[PDB]
Design a protein around this nucleic acid. Structure first.
Lengths: 191, 186, 59, 173, 50, 50, 159
RNA sequence: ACUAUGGUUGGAGACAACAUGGGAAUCCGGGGUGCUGUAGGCU
RNA sequence: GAGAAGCUCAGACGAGUAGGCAGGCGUGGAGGUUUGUGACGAAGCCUUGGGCGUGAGCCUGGGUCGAACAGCCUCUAGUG
RNA sequence: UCUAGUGGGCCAUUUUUGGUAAGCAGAACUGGCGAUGCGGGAUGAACCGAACGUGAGGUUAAGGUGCCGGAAUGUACGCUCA
RNA sequence: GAGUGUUUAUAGCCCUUGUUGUAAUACGUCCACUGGGGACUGAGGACUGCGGCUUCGUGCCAAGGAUGCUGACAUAAUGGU
């Protein structure tokens, strides 16, 4: 119930977060690969600590690597611990993540065949988090906001150009030349 | 339970004079009847002022009566002057005009000067007999705040009132708090 | 322990006799006004009084 | 007891659209005031309309066309649980859809501790075909040669003999 | 006074009948008749002074 | 002259209703109580309270 | 941990608006104020001189005195169980007229014009305002606007 | 989304639902890319 | 007529510590008054009797007792 | 106009700060106890209902109707064996 | 006996419109429409008032607050302690 207590110039003694890396898998992924997404989201407002996030990250990384390999998961930890929960020294002690209801904690994108593997992995990862969490099968293509049917229609038209893990999407804004040169397959409808 | 605020419940007016004068009670009885049986506000005013205390019935002088009834735009030439209180004399008025005055009581000097000048002095019962409803009557009052206590009432910072002083002169409340040369001036 | 400030009963006490409004008067003292304005209004009001008195006397 | 009402409402006409659309809902409420409240409750979730900015143009109570005919009613509901939200389907044999809705509310309260506030009635339909019936318990009541013993009851009570403290003989069955 | 009361009673019945026929006409035509909003309301205090 | 007529009428001192209120008196009429707007049900409430 | 500075807790109160800094519009100096006018007090952060206290920011009062570059806005402030008269000398940069008074003047002019017109026409005038009346009776039609039946939507995942 | 009011509402709690009311931000999309007062010159 | 300090009609209201005000009950002494009470029994005291007042208190029956005492209008205080 | 007492507060809802926490300490709003009897929560200064002159009759609030205890061992649909 | 495989055969269900039919019933609302049963209260103390009926009268009435007809006891009852 305390007020937010981020690391600022007024209190610079905030200790380093236990968790350093946030993404595990093919960080340099592509649009075609990883078409399915699985989310682990808390069902209430908790104060998950960075230590618990570290344990969940280690368990998820080891399990996914050993059971699906390097090339079958792109798990990432959405939670970033910024709030400080003070503890009396035997004053900042550690970092915790403030998450509300419906805030995604863990998000992994895999293929359609690895749906059960991702479900099992994030089910076993619930024991490392305080409170109640739920697992949902996202309807969006990977980490992008567009749904499955919208994404496939956009891909069929040819309005998506992959750029690393993410991609560039055509919009009806900006100069025509800079978009026409970049997009060869874009069918600009004259209406 | 009933949620009613009780602010103006008990009336703060006298229903009876505090004095035990039997003649004053007789006058009150007469004007109680007059106020009840007449539709004139003069009788009600006289009855209300009969209940009033000494401080609430300040004296008036024949000079004040003469001044009030001799105004240029007055037309109070022969009208009877009525005051519920004592009529005092003012020796500063060397010549007394002819005045018809009705009052509770008259100073001996004031009554003698009025009679010598040719006027008449009446009591309240005589005034009631002559003017049962107060027609053609100039109703007057004395200065309520002319007493000593109102020089001190409301005393405070920058109020310009008279303090309660044992004596008058220097060394008596004429120092720090009263002039700029001594800290501050009130 | 000292320094026990609170404001629980202060509003109720103030509203017990209400928030009194200052008495309304038609004329306010000119000491709050400009010195030049007050000095000129003295002569303007004076001349107005003489004009009214002269008109009534002639009438 | 509950009653079924049809409620037709619309947004108050404005300068932008002088002719707003009319929306009708079939609701089960104890009275018309609750029915109108339920109508605005459901309309606020779909359209940018409130009670202040909208109006009710019609409300009519609906009675059962065939109250003397035994029927099967399929009720689709969406209810909030202590954890989340679930959609369920129920089948009830009754003569009125009001009675079927009342049975649904009693069953949900008894089996899930779900109050009135946590239940939304998505749809109520009348099942016509025998193969449409989904619950075996409901479908077993459609056998023309249906025969079962009298259900257990706490004997036969009387307004006076039931209140009698003592009985000369032990009752038999 | 009796004449006024008779006129008031006639006005009440006429207003009630007029609303009934208007509602029946709306039902027959299939349209919707919204009646006048109430101008009089009776209010009862149900809570005590605590 | 509704304002003068209503102000002249002393507030009605109704009795407790015959048959009582609902199970819980201090929730809204829509929620199942006796508070807030009740529309034409005020007539029945006045009937049992008069 | 409490200070009683003049401009304490005025960090956002005395801030200029976004993209509203720099030059002050000169129509404020051209506005004419008279004794008896009802004006609002809005402190301008650029004009430090003639600054009223933060309490009077957003208040409304009546001018009693007019000087070369300031006015005499009169305010009533609660100090307990009474109001006290506060006479603040405020530069015209922090003073603007109240639009309610202009609306009230127009309403009075319209009321008098209607009164004269109704007197000439020998009919009622109806100069008194009224609250919002209850809605009357209408006859909403359904042709080309047939009602659409709505049903509650089943719960589904939206992620 | 948020919020004023209410319950001897649910839940251990965190919180949530409901009832009488008020009501955003942001994103995206559509449209537009100065108006005007005074005094004077202009094939 | 109804102690005009009186008579009569009507409506609303009623918690209370600290504290404020008013009207009353009780005690000693003083002035006035009551053809006032009393050795055929004053005051006081007891009472398993009676009456009045919301109350402070008052009147009275019975027993003991033996020398003083009280009502009303005021005054006063070492007054509960 | 004059004057008394007071100038140790406390509890509950909601919004919080300091604290590991506290029947902890400190702020804001409202209602209360203090100074509030009465019906209910078996009991209780604050909770629910309701604010009180002496009584008669009727009806309720919160709360209850197996016995103690005044009031259905009432009605309808289900779940539960500890 | 145990099962068919076609739409009333020797049975009967469901859905449409015609009348009798302005069908009843249930529910809601209203009646200055009308019948009983039980309980508590009787304040005020010549008259005036508002109403209704009238034979038109200081007439009658349920109309600005209870009267009437009976009986038993009276070392009983009712009160007080």
């Amino acid at each position: 119930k305390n007020k937010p207590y981020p690391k600022s110039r007024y209190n610079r003694a905030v200790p380093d977060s236990k968790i350093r890396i946030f993404d595990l898998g093919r960080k340099r992924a592509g649009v075609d690969e990883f078409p399915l997404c699985i989310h682990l989201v808390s069902n209430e407002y908790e104060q998950i600590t960075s230590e618990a996030l570290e344990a969940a990250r280690i368990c998820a990384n080891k399990y996914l690597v050993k059971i699906g390999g390097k090339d079958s998961f792109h798990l990432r930890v959405r939670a970033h611990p910024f709030h400080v929960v003070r503890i009396n020294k035997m004053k900042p002690n550690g970092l915790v993540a403030r998450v509300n209801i419906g805030q995604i904690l863990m998000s992994v994108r895999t293929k359609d065949s690895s749906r059960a593997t991702a479900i099992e992995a994030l089910r076993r990862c619930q024991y490392k988090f305080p409170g109640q969490q739920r697992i949902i099968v996202s309807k969006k293509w990977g980490f992008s906001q567009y749904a499955r049917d919208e994404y496939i229609e956009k891909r069929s038209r040819g309005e998506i150009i992959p750029d690393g893990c993410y991609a560039k999407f055509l919009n009806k804004r900006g100069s025509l030349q800079e978009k026409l040169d970049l997009f060869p397959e874009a069918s600009f409808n004259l209406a | 339970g009933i949620d009613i605020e009780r602010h103006h419940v008990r009336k703060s007016q006298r229903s009876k004079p505090a004095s035990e004068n039997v003649y004053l009670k007789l006058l009150v009885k007469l004007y109680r009847f007059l106020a009840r049986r007449t539709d004139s506000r003069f009788n009600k005013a006289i009855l209300k002022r009969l209940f009033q205390s000494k401080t609430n019935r300040p004296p008036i002088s024949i000079s004040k009566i003469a001044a009030l009834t001799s105004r240029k735009s007055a037309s109070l030439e022969g009208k009877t002057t009525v005051i519920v209180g004592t009529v005092t004399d003012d020796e500063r008025l060397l010549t007394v005009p002819k005045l018809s005055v009705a009052a509770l009581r008259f100073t001996k000097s004031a009554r003698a000067r009025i009679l010598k000048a040719g006027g008449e002095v009446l009591t309240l019962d005589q005034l009631a007999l002559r003017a049962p409803t107060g027609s053609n009557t100039v109703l007057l009052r004395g200065k309520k705040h002319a007493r000593e206590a109102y020089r001190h009432f409301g005393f405070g910072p920058h109020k310009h009132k008279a303090p309660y002083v044992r004596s008058e002169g220097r060394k008596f409340e004429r120092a720090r708090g009263r002039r700029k040369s001594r800290a501050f001036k009130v | 322990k000292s320094k026990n400030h609170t404001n629980h009963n202060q509003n109720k006490k103030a509203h017990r006799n209400g928030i009194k409004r200052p008495q309304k008067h038609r004329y306010d003292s000119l000491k709050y006004r400009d010195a030049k304005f007050r000095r000129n209004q003295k002569f303007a009001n004076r001349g107005t009084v003489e004009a009214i008195r002269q008109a009534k006397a002639s009438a | 007891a509950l009653k079924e009402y049809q409620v037709v409402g619309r947004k108050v006409p404005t300068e932008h659209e002088p002719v707003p659309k009319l929306f009708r809902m079939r609701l089960f409420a104890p009275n018309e005031s609750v029915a109108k409240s339920r109508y605005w409750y459901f309309l606020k979730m779909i359209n940018k309309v409130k009670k202040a900015t909208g109006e009710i143009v019609a409300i009519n109570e609906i009675s059962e066309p065939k109250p003397l005919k035994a029927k099967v009613f399929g009720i689709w509901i969406r209810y909030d649980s202590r954890s989340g939200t679930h959609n369920m389907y129920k089948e009830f044999r009754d003569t009125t859809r009001v009675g079927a809705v009342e049975a649904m509310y009693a069953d949900m309260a008894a089996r899930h501790r779900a109050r009135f506030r946590s239940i939304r009635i998505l749809k109520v339909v009348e099942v016509e075909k025998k193969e449409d019936v989904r619950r075996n318990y409901v479908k077993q009541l459609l056998n023309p040669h249906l025969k079962f013993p009298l259900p257990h009851r706490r004997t036969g009570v009387v307004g006076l003999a039931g209140k009698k403290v003592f009985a000369p003989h032990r009752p038999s069955t | 006074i009796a004449k006024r009361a008779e006129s008031y009673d006639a006005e009440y019945r006429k207003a009630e009948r007029e609303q009934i026929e208007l509602g029946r006409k709306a039902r027959a035509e299939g349209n919707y008749y919204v009646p006048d909003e109430t101008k009089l309301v009776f209010v009862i205090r149900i809570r005590g002074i605590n | 002259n509704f304002k003068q007529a209503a102000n002249f009428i002393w507030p009605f001192q109704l009795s407790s209703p015959l048959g009582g209120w609902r199970d819980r008196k201090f929730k809204h009429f829509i929620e199942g109580g006796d508070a807030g707007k009740r529309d034409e049900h005020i007539n029945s409430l006045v009937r049992k309270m008069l | 941990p409490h200070s009683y500075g003049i401009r304490a807790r005025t960090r956002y109160t005395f801030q200029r608006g976004f993209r509203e800094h720099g030059q002050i519009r000169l129509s404020t100096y051209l506005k004419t104020y008279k004794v008896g006018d009802i004006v609002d007090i809005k402190v301008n952060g650029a004009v430090q001189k003639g600054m009223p206290h933060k309490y009077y920011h957003g208040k409304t009062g009546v001018v009693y005195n007019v000087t070369q570059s300031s006015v005499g806005v009169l305010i009533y402030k609660v100090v307990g169980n009474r109001y006290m008269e506060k006479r603040v000398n405020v530069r015209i940069e922090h003073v603007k007229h109240s639009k309610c008074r202009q609306d009230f003047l127009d309403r009075v002019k319209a009321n008098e014009a209607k009164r004269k017109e109704a007197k000439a026409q020998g009919k009622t005038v109806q100069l008194r305002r009224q609250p919002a009346p209850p809605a009357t009776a209408h006859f909403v039609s359904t042709e080309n606007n047939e009602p659409v039946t709505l049903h509650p939507v089943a719960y589904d995942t939206t992620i």
